[PDB]
Structure 1
């Protein structure tokens, strides 16, 4: 025999901060009056630092607690509910890390509810998650740029680049993660009409200390802002939205760091490659 068990979080958006308290309810629907030995809950917070494809790469734990929610007993048929709570705090001055999903620094905060049974049934396990936001920390730093073949340092075989004089500017590289990346791009001249213009958010993560580490770069998202040969002198706009929590404020830690950047990648009719790699000091303000 099997029944239904679930974990419910009071806040719809699951957003929580240091100094707050997480609250919820464990709710079970049962087709039978199931006698059991106990249903327990466990709250954990961890960061699963992977290793670049060692000394200080072990997973670390930020917060941990557990409560045997239910002693041995019996759950009747129908609906049954038992509240539960947990405190979100750390020893001393330590602060919680941001709920970051990545590829080499994955920070998570989870609840696990386990049910125990006997003859005529079996034990079950349930998982969950909730969102933890880093504390609030502003001065814009607009970066005027001129995408020209002569300004592409990485381009040493420039013979293949036809003349162009792309101009524009980002309103800021110090981006409030709750506000979009905004800017302008103007095609002041293009011997080869633009084939496309893209905005590539690259996350770079470092997992280690000064003794030895590997820096790894990946692309969160690519969006396209102009397709085909735009009119010369027309101000194409650069509106970008920052992932809800796929992106976290950049972190400086003795063991790891997470940082971001934006690449403006322009493609020309002869499949040319432009790449302007601006910085990105993301923050929560």
Structure 2
């Protein structure tokens, strides 16, 4: 019969901080007692630079695409040939968050064009009662509290059809008066946004007012940088025709791992933006974006 092995990272989030000690358990669990030629484990961190295929040109994009640069790799062996009880066995390991690797220990970031990962790989050289097992984990590293401390960055915007810039449809857009506010365009990666948004005139009712986020990631190539954005948030904040003269509030608990402090590097870039899309009842559509720079402490 076969065997199962599993990796436990102590901190239930599998999140570790710059300068921390890294801690993990490996679990062996089985219907039958376990013997192996050994159990072997790697820890890794990577940034993955997916130059956008059409943006560079697909072949050149993948050629240049800096596929997961190992931020870090330290390697250890955890158990020599050993024989163990069935239901559980657990042996401990640690790895050092120190540059046994290419680049200075970024935070795990599951972006798209820029991806950043930290990962482990295991093998148990099981007794030939059964095959050697190979297993992998993925885990988050978090940045240390930054040298530059936070301060809030409130910003306001006012909207009517005339306010709009290069909008093809300005004449199509019906009468309205709006003002929008962000309580701090400085925001912490894991932590919440607050904003105010007034409707104080409208000729038109609305079916959807959307409040939306874009993540934008860039990879470098020896000739060029290719920059690509993806959108993932929505709260739609309209039901029934919005009263004129009122303010409505803006809320966001910043997306858990698909978002980070705004990143800019020699090899890759990641910037963030806030988007606005309004689907009126006549559905004349207006859109405004602001770009964001984000912090961790």
C-alpha RMSD of matched pairs (Å):
2.2
- Given the superposition, is the C-alpha separation of residues 266 and 77 from structure 1 closer, same or farther in structure 2, using an over 3 Å criterion? closer
| 1: CA distance, partners of 2:91 / 2:100 | 29
Moved more, 138-147 or 3-12: 138-147
Query: CA offsets per residue over residues 147-185 of structure 1, 9 Å max, x none?
Result: 211122131332211111111211122222243221111
Contact 1:195/1:228, CA 8 A, preserved across alignment: yes
1:113–1:94 distance in 2 versus 1, CA, 3 Å: closer
Determine helix, strand or coil for the equivalent of 1:74: strand
**CA deviation after TM superposition for structure 1 residue 51, in Å:** 2.4
Consecutive unaligned residues of structure 2, counting only runs of 5 or more, are 54-62
* CA deviation profile, 1:180-235 (whole Å, cap 9, x unmatched): 22111111110002222111110111100583121101112122223331211122
CA-to-aligned-CA distance 1:39-93 (integer Å, 9 cap, x gap)? 1011111122112124473531111011121222333434322111111122799
Alignment of 1:48-59 (within 5 A): 48-53=48-53, 54-55=63-64, 57-59=66-68
Contact 1:184 1:235 in 2 (8 A): yes
Residues 205-214 or 267-276, more deviating? 205-214
Q: Does the residue aligned with 2:286 lie in a helix, a strand or coil?
A: coil
- Deviates further, 198-207 or 141-150: 141-150
Aligned length: 285
Cα gap change, 1:87 to 1:246, in 2 (>3 Å): same
Deviates more, 1:90-99 or 1:8-17: 90-99
CA deviation after TM superposition for structure 1 residue 263, in Å: 0.9
TM-score (norm 1): 0.92
Find the aligned partners of 1:93 and 1:19 in 2 and give their Cα distance: 17
Does structure 2 retain, via aligned residues, the 8 Å contact 1:99–1:248?
A: no
**Against the structure 1 CA distance between its residues 79 and 91, is the aligned structure 2 distance closer, same or farther, given a 3 Å change threshold?**
closer
| 4+ residue runs over 4 A deviation | 91-94
Q: Deviations 1:230-249 (Å, cap 9, x if unpaired)?
A: 21112211111101222111
Give the one of 207, 217, 221 matched to 1:195: 207
**TM-score, with length taken from structure 2:** 0.88
The answer (yes or no) to whether the contact 1:196–1:267 under 8 Å persists in 2 is yes
Deviation at 1:134, TM superposition (A): 1.4
Q: Which residues of 2 match residues 108-187 of structure 1 at below 5 A?
A: 108-137=117-146, 138-187=150-199
Alignment partners' CA distance in 1, 2:102 and 2:225: 27
Which segments of 5 or more consecutive residues in structure 1 lack a partner in the other structure? none
CA gap of 1:130–1:25, structure 2 versus 1, over 3 A, is same
Contact 1:225 1:238 in 2 (8 A): no
